[PDB]
Amino acid sequence: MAKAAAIGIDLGTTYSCVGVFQHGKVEIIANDQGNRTTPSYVAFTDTERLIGDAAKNQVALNPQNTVFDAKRLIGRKFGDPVVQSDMKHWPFQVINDGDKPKVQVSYKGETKAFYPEEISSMVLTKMKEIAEAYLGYPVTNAVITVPAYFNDSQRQATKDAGVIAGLNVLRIINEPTAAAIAYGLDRTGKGERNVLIFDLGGGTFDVSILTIDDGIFEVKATAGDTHLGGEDFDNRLVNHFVEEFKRKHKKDISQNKRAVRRLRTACERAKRTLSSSTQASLEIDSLFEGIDFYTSITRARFEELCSDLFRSTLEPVEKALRDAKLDKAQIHDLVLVGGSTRIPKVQKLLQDFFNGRDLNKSINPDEAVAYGAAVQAAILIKSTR
Numbered sequence: 339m340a341k342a343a344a345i346g347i348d349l350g351t352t353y354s355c356v357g358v359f360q361h362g363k364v365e366i367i368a369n370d371q372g373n374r375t376t377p378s379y380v381a382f383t384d385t386e387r388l389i390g391d392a393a394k395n396q397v398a399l400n401p402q403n404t405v406f407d408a409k410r411l412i413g414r415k416f417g418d419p420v421v422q423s424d425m426k427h428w429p430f431q432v433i434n435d436g437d438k439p440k441v442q443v444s445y446k447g448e449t450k451a452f453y454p455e456e457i458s459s460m461v462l463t464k465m466k467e468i469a470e471a472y473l474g475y476p477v478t479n480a481v482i483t484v485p486a487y488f489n490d491s492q493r494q495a496t497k498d499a500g501v502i503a504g505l506n507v508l509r510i511i512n513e514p515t516a517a518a519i520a521y522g523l524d525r526t527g528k529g530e531r532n533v534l535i536f537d538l539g540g541g542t543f544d545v546s547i548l549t550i551d552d553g554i555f556e557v558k559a560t561a562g563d564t565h566l567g568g569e570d571f572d573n574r575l576v577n578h579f580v581e582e583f584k585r586k587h588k589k590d591i592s593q594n595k596r597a598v599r600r601l602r603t604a605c606e607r608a609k610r611t612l613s614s615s616t617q618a619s620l621e622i623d624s625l626f627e628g629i630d631f632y633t634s635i636t637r638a639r640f641e642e643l644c645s646d647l648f649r650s651t652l653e654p655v656e657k658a659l660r661d662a663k664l665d666k667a668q669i670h671d672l673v674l675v676g677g678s679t680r681i682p683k684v685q686k687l688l689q690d691f692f693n694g695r696d697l698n699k700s701i702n703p704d705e706a707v708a709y710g711a712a713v714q715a716a717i718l719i720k721s722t723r
């Protein structure tokens with residue numbers, strides 16, 4: 339029953355996803371708000387602790403006590419130049435506890451501090467409860483994914499987050515490995531298979547090259563930009579609409595925090611519409627000083643606003659190919675991961691760089707990692723018996 343059941347968890351920087359392999363198929367489990375992905379946010383309020391969508395929806399009103407990006411801190415030392423550089427951009431306090439970073443917040447009127455693994459365990463507990471509500475029974479066995487560049491300390495801290503959350507961690511697997519498993523790329527029989535995983539998420543870009551030799555996976559190269567993702571494209575849209583409001587009304591909205599946030603959420607939504615339509619409309623009642631902002635943007639204009647950012651995704655692809663010592667024609671499969679890979683211009687650029695090659699994109703890219711982890715969790719729990 340419960341002891342023979344296992345889940346796959348994609349514990350992401352900005353979003354998390356949970357899957358279960360049963361009756362010959364993977365089911366990506368929707369949360370209580372009907373969403374197949376849940377924000378990796380934890381809010382501490384005057385009465386409660388919020389996780390996911392409810393935490394993300396109140397980030398504007400409570401920025402000092404809403405934690406996100408815990409994956410950027412997990413398994414790292416306080417003195418690490420990555421930690422020191424990132425701290426300058428977060429609205430929450432990061433403190434030092436014996437060369438280990440802790441996030442310090444106000445919760446139920448008291449000052450509390452949490453280790454990154456305790457923050458990640460609260461996200462994992464939510465993913466576990468989403469699976470339990472769908473299954474009708476508690477599930478405790480899980481496969482958790484990590485980026486392929488995570489070292490031993492980051493992997494151990496992720497496993498510890500799993501233990502705190504009440505999960506029995508069957509295995510910690512690499513995100514590009516879970517993605518290749520989702521597409522069945524490890525069941526092609528004999529001979530070495532070279533796979534490139536192009537992972538463009540909300541806040542990070544990762545390129546991974548894997549060799550699959552008779553079921554055995556090997557990471558040949560990892561490249562990317564830890565500070566490039568979907569949120570940079572939303573900000574390019576925001577800047578355009580701030581300048582358009584200034585041309586139509588002779589009023590600068592940039593300093594009005596509420597106006598910029600409402601514009602940012604509308605831009606994120608418009609950006610998503612632009613993946614399946616050639617135009618999107620913005621409908622913001624009383625954006626600033628009682629002025630409604632009813633406008634539209636074409637896909638062509640959006641592609642111009644982000645042109646330099648889209649083109650920059652090809653330098654890590656080339657860098658990963660030289661590090662792996664492979665030419666383009668030596669790559670057998672191209673796999674898309676992350677919601678931003680739905681952008682048609684991103685797909686066109688990658689396909690043209692690989693000389694008109696077909697892309698593996700039939701599995702929802704923001705769900706492919708949880709899908710593969712769910713498949714691996716089923717295989718592992720069966721062998722355990």
Ligand SMILES: Nc1ncnc2c1nc(Cl)n2[C@@H]1O[C@H](CO)[C@@H](O)[C@H]1O
Pocket residue numbers: 353538539540541567568569606609610611613676677678679680681704
């Ligand atoms: N249809 C879409 N067109 C463009 N971007 C998308 C789309 N869906 C998601 Cl999710 N994202 C973005 O992917 C990230 C999460 O993986 C977020 O930045 C989200 O906006």
